Amino acid sequence: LAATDTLRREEAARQALAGSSEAAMALAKARYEGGVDDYLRYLDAQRS
Amino acid sequence: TLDSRMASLELVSQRRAAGAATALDYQEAVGLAEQARAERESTERQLR
Amino acid sequence: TLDSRMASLELVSQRRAAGAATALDYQEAVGLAEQARAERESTERQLR
Amino acid sequence: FKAALSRAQGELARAEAQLFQAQAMVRRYEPLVKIDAVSQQDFDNAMAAL
């Protein structure tokens, strides 16, 4: 029971982290397509 | 530690509301807060 | 993820060929790509 | 006076080049600030430079 509850909440936290990283990806792609940031920043956002 | 993370997140959110921070900084602050939350959940599971 | 690492490595190699990057940057890119390869191998072992 | 005119024209060309750089920076930064991709302070600095 303790594992079920704790891993449910932890999965929620990790899902929030994944969503934040996806938003950072979207912003980095938008910047790169505009010619402001280099390809390295976009690729690093992908990796992260 | 999580209290500290939330304080930093609040400060970064207030700073972006004033335009002094990019959305990238807000996203990284959110990511750090979520990362700390997962650690708190893991510690809760261990204690229980 | 490995694909992203090789893309970054190719870009960094092309930049050093033009003299805009130091050999240290090429070495760090190579190290990151090799690190990613090890993760791929570990995950292959886990899946098998 | 021809040499003085040449010097003035060279300075004008340099100013025009800097203006072109500023215009390109502002044109790139304008759509980004609408999606928060860049800070409002950076966009204001770019506009002041323009």
Place this chain on the structure above:
Amino acid sequence: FKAALSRAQGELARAEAQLFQAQAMVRRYEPLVKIDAVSQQDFDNAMAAL
């Protein structure tokens, strides 16, 4: 007048050195921007400097 000419020639040499540096920078950045190795902003800055 000879000394003034020497001073002007020295300033011209300094300007030529800076132009050579800018030309080398632009020549190196030209193929890299096509493969997205450097940001478009950096390329425009290099062109403005040239």
